[PDB]
Symmetry: C2
Subunit: 195 residues, 2 copies
Amino acid sequence: KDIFKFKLVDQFFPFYYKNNKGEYEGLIFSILDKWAKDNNADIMVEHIDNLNESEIEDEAIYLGLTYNVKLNDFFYFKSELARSISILFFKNSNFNIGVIKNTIYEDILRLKNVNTIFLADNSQELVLALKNDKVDYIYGDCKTLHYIANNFLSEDLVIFTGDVFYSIKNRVAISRNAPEIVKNLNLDLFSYLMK
Amino acid sequence: SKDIFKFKLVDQFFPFYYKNNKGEYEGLIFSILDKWAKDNNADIMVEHIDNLNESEIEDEAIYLGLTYNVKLNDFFYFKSELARSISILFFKNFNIGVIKNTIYEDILRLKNVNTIFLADNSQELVLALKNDKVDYIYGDCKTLHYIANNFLSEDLVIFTGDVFYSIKNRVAISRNAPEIVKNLNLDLFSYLMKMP
Ligand SMILES: [Mg+2]
């Protein structure tokens, strides 16, 4: 009956990602299908590389966003998916650090007064920036960035051992101007992972 | 007197600790443990072990990389949560491989899987898949995938079927541990600063 739009942002292993062979992978559809049946509804899935405040769809449910001062004005963050850990990577003095824009990782670097921040639109772009030595470090998701890096880089990634490790919540997000029916949805997708 | 405590890092646990190409251990756990050490006014010793041998269990040691298991529960007390994982059935491009004495083993026995191949550690487990000793492996989503992808040039495929459990990774100490260890606050996760 009802049809709800889900938006997958960038990449988020293991929920959704692009493998070495360029094939879209993930178990998110398995979860969304189960959520759909429980809610007696159909779903539309859209994938977006980078989020823009001007292109926000009020009725859509966003996955793969993290808390960000800019995005907080537009979104309500609800149920948690898997958690992540922020890591600063470099390839195996003055410097510059790559980071995906409008993410919690950007805000972390900003409040640390890092002024040589290189803003990438997505994970792939960020990794390629490191490849072509546009940046000396990249900052972001522990597994997803490491994974994409190993797909494009010939050099191994190394972890920068400093005070840069934070526990990151990856939550489901809806527009603050979402219809009441969306706002009343149970969006605890993580509950479909029994324990 | 500043106390000294031994931490045993079992197998591999991405991104807390894992093997790189140089035969060394990379990870962020070492940073966390140094922080924990400062607040508890103590020194620390880190030792890596691939397998968990009952004969080699040290009562004074604090164990990381263990999950709740019917067999280990009779030897360890599982304490604070360090991180979470998702159980995934992996395959390349029917017997199932799984690390012995893990929560993952129990799951397969509860689901009444007939042909269970037991591995001692993640490295052995993923090697069994690579060498076609097993058709599927079951375990940690990040770690098993990392090893296969970085050491064996194998990008493992996730089994779509309903086999996804939320797994808690906890700190564990021996049942016969010293009183000085039992009194420790082993909330290592708290030393990972949270978002606001
Ligand atoms: Mg596929």
